[PDB]
Design a protein around this ligand. Structure first.
Ligand SMILES: COCC[C@H]1CNC(=O)c2c1[nH]c(-c1ccncc1F)c2Nc1cccc(Cl)c1OC
Length: 292
């Protein structure tokens, strides 16, 4: 059962703006619980009220048992707007992190992040949840060795006798969506596997924009012609074939998140065999459009 903890605005202090975009506005602060005096660093989101409360319901529904690689909602705050509260991730989003530390990320970190995103997505698949927005921008970095999936804005829960979600005319990310989602607005856990492949391609290219220069309306025709995202220079054939298996026309032929945990975990045990990065031993660490 989903339960929300209504937190008072007087409990939050030192609110500073982290960023803004399609997600709305994300801030950072210090949550002092009532009675307790432990200053917990937290993040606050804003944007209309109908949309942010759907996100809170989705996050609260999948909170028990919970997964270490999935962001969990601490509670909500009722100021002039409805705000979401979660544990702060000090190192920000992974898309910016891979673009900032281009020359310091080793093969072990890239493969472990792929394992962790697949562990989080497999947990969401078990809780009948289709994320519908898996991208490097929606992956946060708690510490360089630990990542979490975020932004349950487009996420939808599936009923017991429901294996797919049909969207209406809302804005959606075309360059991360599967071909069936662009053509027929159909969203399954296998459509999230396509987005997982695009997210893996983003990490392997250190934050390259997918299909750069190509407009969103030309993507369906490009994917029907057999064209896919290119092989990143650091990827061996085994890593690139996983990405290409995530982008197959038949959604059931694509890999499963439980299979991607095993495949990338095997690769993480011998990382230099599967990714070729210069000076790997020396390294050390401490969009949306209307469909038609
Ligand atoms: C600043 O924007 C980065 C990407 C942005 C993209 N979309 C997000 O949803 C989000 C982002 N940052 C953080 C975030 C979280 C935790 N610590 C730091 C951070 F920045 C997000 N989650 C988030 C923020 C506040 C409350 C809740 Cl319940 C959240 O989970 C949905």
């Amino acid at each position: 059962q989903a339960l929300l903890r209504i937190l008072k605005e007087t409990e939050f202090k030192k609110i500073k703006v982290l960023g803004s975009g399609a997600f709305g506005t994300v801030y950072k602060g210090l949550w002092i619980p009532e009675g307790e005096k432990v200053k917990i660093p937290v993040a606050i989101k804003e944007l209309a009220n109908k949309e942010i409360l759907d996100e809170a319901y989705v996050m609260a529904s999948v909170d028990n048992p919970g997964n270490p690689h999935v962001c969990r909602l601490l509670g909500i705050c009722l100021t002039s707007t409805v705000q979401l509260i979660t544990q702060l991730m000090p190192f920000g989003c992974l898309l910016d992190y891979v673009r900032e530390h281009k020359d310091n990320i080793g093969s072990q970190y890239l493969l472990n992040w792929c394992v962790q995103i697949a562990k989080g997505m497999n947990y969401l698949e078990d809780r009948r949840l289709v994320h519908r927005d898996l991208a490097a921008r929606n992956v946060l970095v708690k510490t360089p060795q630990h990542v979490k999936i975020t932004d349950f804005g487009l996420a939808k829960l599936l009923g017991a006798e429901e294996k797919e979600y049909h969207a209406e005319g809302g804005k959606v990310p075309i360059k991360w969506m599967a071909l069936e989602s662009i053509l027929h607005r159909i969203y399954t856990h296998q459509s999230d596997v396509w987005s997982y492949g695009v997210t893996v391609w983003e990490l392997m290219t250190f934050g390259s924009k997918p299909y750069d220069g190509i407009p969103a309306s030309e993507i369906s025709s490009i994917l029907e012609k057999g064209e896919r995202l290119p092989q990143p220079p650091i990827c061996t054939i085994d890593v690139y074939m996983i990405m290409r298996k995530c982008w197959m026309i038949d959604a059931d032929s694509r890999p499963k998140f439980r299979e991607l945990i095993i495949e990338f975990s095997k690769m993480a045990r011998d990382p230099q065999r599967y990714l070729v990065i210069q000076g790997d031993e020396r390294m050390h660490l401490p969009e949306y459009l209307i469909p038609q």
